[PDB]
Ligand binder design. Structure first.
Ligand SMILES: CCCC(CCC)COc1cc([C@H](O)CCN)ccc1F
Ligand SMILES: CCCC(CCC)COc1cc([C@H](O)CCN)ccc1F
Ligand SMILES: CCCCCCCCCCCCCCCC(=O)O
Ligand SMILES: CCCCCCCCCCCCCCCC(=O)O
Ligand SMILES: [Fe+2]
Ligand SMILES: [Fe+2]
Lengths: 502, 499
């Protein structure tokens, strides 16, 4: 039944912390795997007010870069605020200078570079990002801020997502609003050794459903041969003391438009895939199965923007109020969509999904639109399987079995989940008054199976007579606890990150 | 993984049989419960050709009334063809006289092959036309033909009337609109309840000249639920009934509610994606919401297109290939809000704590529904749903029983917990069961305290060709079988008549 959080410990996820001067040694319980050698780098808000001036939204707090270093079964923790224009000017003027997602600054358009969302590699470099034109080059060893990079200096995009796809050779793919949506390709580091960002190019363009209103895009799908873009009814009103949140509106009638592009031939495919309205933030994985694309999504059922429920005032409320606030919110649901690549007019009015292992359907209509119904993989009442992660390096863009997720209880993260996407079997890790982060999968170096390895999660546990936070290591097989690295300081919410092997 | 039927035993479901002169004694294995006293009455096609003239569709074969009698742990089996106009005139002229669902004759059919239900002290076999056939539940003798058009304004009525505990019968039929018929219980005057039939409420039609096909509907103490599907009857259209059906590609599904007691249609514009619907599982009230549990087929193509006898009689590899592009079966829970507040425009109105079903209030006042999926298997349907109807029909409930269809071939019995989504399965190789009917232990306090009865075809060499199966309703564990030495063709629906 319902898991309750009356003690309200989750409030510590949204509480300001101070950065460290140097790494702290973490107290190890259990056994840190001896093959686990490298850095867990994660981004989140760390400063939720500048003096007496508050930040209002979950995505407003100033970017804090976190690092757990693993070597010979020992763990250190280090955090440094990213020296963005937003942060630097805030410390200088002792006020909010740059307008954030849901917080207007008061004394042309100074766009935020608050890189609080994710960090990803480009060539030999690492970049913290939000979803604007500004990404921040950071030192993954010292957590020092190196440089601000404006993507508009290199390619035709107004912004880019915090969820670029990274191929094994180091090629980076991303999507951004431009009205159309452009796929950016950043090549691997060449022999010439010059900045790969200076060789950035637009490979393909997706059309927009509304001439003057682009959809919000958080992530996209990538296979060896295809790019998948999901156009949601969450629209940016370009016509609109305003912040970014004030620009969003919901298109009630369009539902969801799904788009595919040939990756290698760099060409948009004019297949009009249509389905019912949902919010989409995170693609889980995409792959090719005969003449079909399998598109696994973390969906929110409805066209109301889920971000409306993520103001800090609401997330800091007592548990009964948090539950009441989420009553009319979109319902989370993991959905498998199946997109047919071969459309035969002779099959008009019929289900084109001939695959033997799915209940997903695709109806070819007379107007040539292809109406999709999903196969539901996971559905819990206001219990989201979110911040999805897979064995990305080996199974990204390919047939796969296992996804790992953060479980959201009325938007409060309170458990870690593993989903078998073929059988729909689930595993759960949960402890009372313990609020984990996105689980990141690290393979055992001699892995035979897809789930031979561990998942790493940063957990807040502020209950009296306990360590306030710890790094959790679970066995990827059954989410059984392997170890914890405990610290004696709070760690606020983190969204995304990576494991950097050394 | 996939269960296979290469031996093709399912073909015996669609093979003609002869009726019996008197009941046969069935060989009992295991133990028939001693509290199980009464008659399992079931309807199906029994004659699939008149001489050299074939019937083409699953719903064309001439109505055969089946009875398994239970008394003191002993079982008898009896079957008699229903003496309909269709059957009588066919035996007289030695040809197909009346046009059936998918077979043109070279006069509306009264071929009552679908279901049997009580009205007052009487029992009626039915199809989905204006003609129902009064039958003797003890002898299986045909008593009379009744034309519902002589009594109420309907062109037909479904084979799935709702029966309240007092014996009140509710049904729905095309009239363009859809009329709810109410037949009262038998009164002290003791005159035919059908002569007191009345239209209590009317549902509007999405298309002025094209009514939707309606197979069943939902009933609660306070509400009637009607699901208007994109499967349309083209009234403008050597034609049979199947030739009149077309799919509306754009309308999707319209859901309709009526106040049962105030006899008034409620103008709430519930809308969702296209599916075929034959069987409502159950409907109930939960605060200011209707819980609507449905056996759905995802798509607007008519599922009946896949139920021609030629296709169902094909070898197993061909049967699987034929179902590749068919609508996908899925058990769905829809939640319909009764209280629509304009202040909640653009938001999910389903505030219930135990569902992922949503209902979005749009600016045009349409309410867009998303279901909670309870059961979904690749071309594996949970169909012919049954519940503890007498005690949990129209009320909060936990358990449904179903026939499992493997590419439209019935090959297993299923139990679904609609709250937890836990399933139980009974299945044996080369065994093709019928709709499971639940019979409560007479002193049961719990919902699933009893048995389910299913008629099973098992034509494998060195085995009895058919048997009555009794499973424990708790876990679908086998309790007994009553074996017979003759074939039993497919049956659709029926009831247990306690004695
Ligand atoms: C008017 C909407 C603009 C859109 C695209 C920018 C071209 C989103 O922009 C932003 C997004 C965010 C967070 O990263 C969102 C939570 N992941 C912070 C600040 C942003 F400005
Ligand atoms: C053009 C469609 C007419 C509609 C009746 C509306 C007045 C359906 O009628 C019939 C249905 C059937 C079976 O019972 C269907 C399988 N349950 C057999 C013969 C029928 F004539
Ligand atoms: C870790 C955050 C917990 C508090 C609220 C969680 C709500 C998440 C909703 C789904 C994902 C939306 C974006 C969240 C962060 C991101 O993906 O950049
Ligand atoms: C017992 C049937 C087995 C053979 C094919 C059955 C396919 C049924 C598909 C959904 C139900 C449609 C109507 C079937 C019987 C009825 O209710 O009239
Ligand atoms: Fe994200
Ligand atoms: Fe039926």
């Amino acid at each position: 039944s319902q898991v309750e959080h009356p003690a309200g410990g989750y409030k510590k996820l949204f509480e300001t912390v101070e950065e460290l001067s140097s790494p702290l040694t973490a107290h190890v319980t259990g056994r840190i795997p001896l093959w686990l050698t490298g850095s867990l780098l994660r981004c989140g808000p760390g400063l939720f007010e500048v003096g007496s001036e508050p930040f209002y939204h979950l995505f407003d707090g100033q970017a804090l870069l976190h690092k757990f270093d693993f070597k010979e079964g020992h763990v250190t923790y280090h955090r440094r605020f990213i020296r963005t224009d937003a942060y630097v000017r805030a410390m200088t003027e002792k006020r909010i200078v740059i307008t954030e997602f849901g917080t207007c600054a008061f004394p042309g358009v100074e766009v935020t570079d608050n890189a609080l969302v994710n960090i990803y590699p480009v060539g030999e470099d690492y970049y913290a990002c939000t979803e604007t034109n500004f990404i921040t080059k950071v030192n993954p060893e010292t957590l020092e801020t190196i440089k601000q990079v404006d993507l508009c200096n290199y390619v035709s995009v107004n912004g880019a997502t915090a969820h670029p796809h990274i191929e094994n050779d180091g090629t980076v793919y991303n999507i951004g609003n431009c009205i159309a949506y452009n796929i950016v390709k950043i090549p691997p580091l060449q022999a010439d050794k010059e900045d790969p960002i200076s060789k950035s190019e637009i490979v393909v363009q997706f059309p927009c459903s509304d001439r003057f209103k682009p959809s919000y895009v958080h992530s996209f799908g990538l296979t060896p041969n295809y790019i998948v873009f999901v156009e949601t009814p969450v629209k940016i009103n370009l016509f609109k003391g305003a912040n970014y949140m004030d620009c969003f509106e919901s298109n009630e009638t369009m539902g969801v438009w799904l788009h595919i592009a040939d990756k290698k031939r760099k060409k948009y495919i004019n297949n009009k895939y249509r389905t019912s309205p949902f919010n989409l933030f995170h693609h889980i994985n995409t792959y090719e199965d005969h003449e079909f694309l399998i598109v696994d999504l973390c969906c929110w059922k409805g066209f109301e923007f889920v971000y409306n429920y993520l103001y800090l005032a609401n997330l800091r409320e007592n548990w009964e109020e948090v539950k009441k606030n989420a009553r009319k919110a979109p319902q989370p649901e993991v959905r498998r969509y199946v997109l047919p690549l071969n459309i035969d007019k002779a099959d008009t009015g019929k289900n084109l999904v001939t695959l033997p292992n799915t209940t997903a359907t695709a109806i070819l209509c007379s107007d040539e639109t292809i109406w999709l119904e999903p196969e539901v993989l996971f559905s819990g009442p206001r219990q989201a399987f979110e911040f999805p992660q897979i064995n990305y390096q080996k199974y990204g863009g390919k047939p796969y079995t296992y996804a790992y997720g953060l479980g959201l209880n009325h938007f409060v993260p309170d458990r870690l989940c593993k989903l078998n996407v073929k059988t729909k079997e689930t595993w759960v890790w949960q402890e009372p008054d313990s609020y984990p982060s996105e689980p990141i999968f690290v393979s055992h170096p001699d892995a035979l199976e897809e789930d031979d390895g561990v998942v790493l999660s940063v957990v807040v546990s502020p209950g009296a007579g306990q360590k306030p936070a710890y790094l959790l290591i679970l066995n990827a097989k059954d989410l059984s606890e392997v170890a914890r690295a405990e610290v004696e300081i709070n760690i606020p919410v983190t969204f995304h990150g990576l494991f950097k092997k050394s």
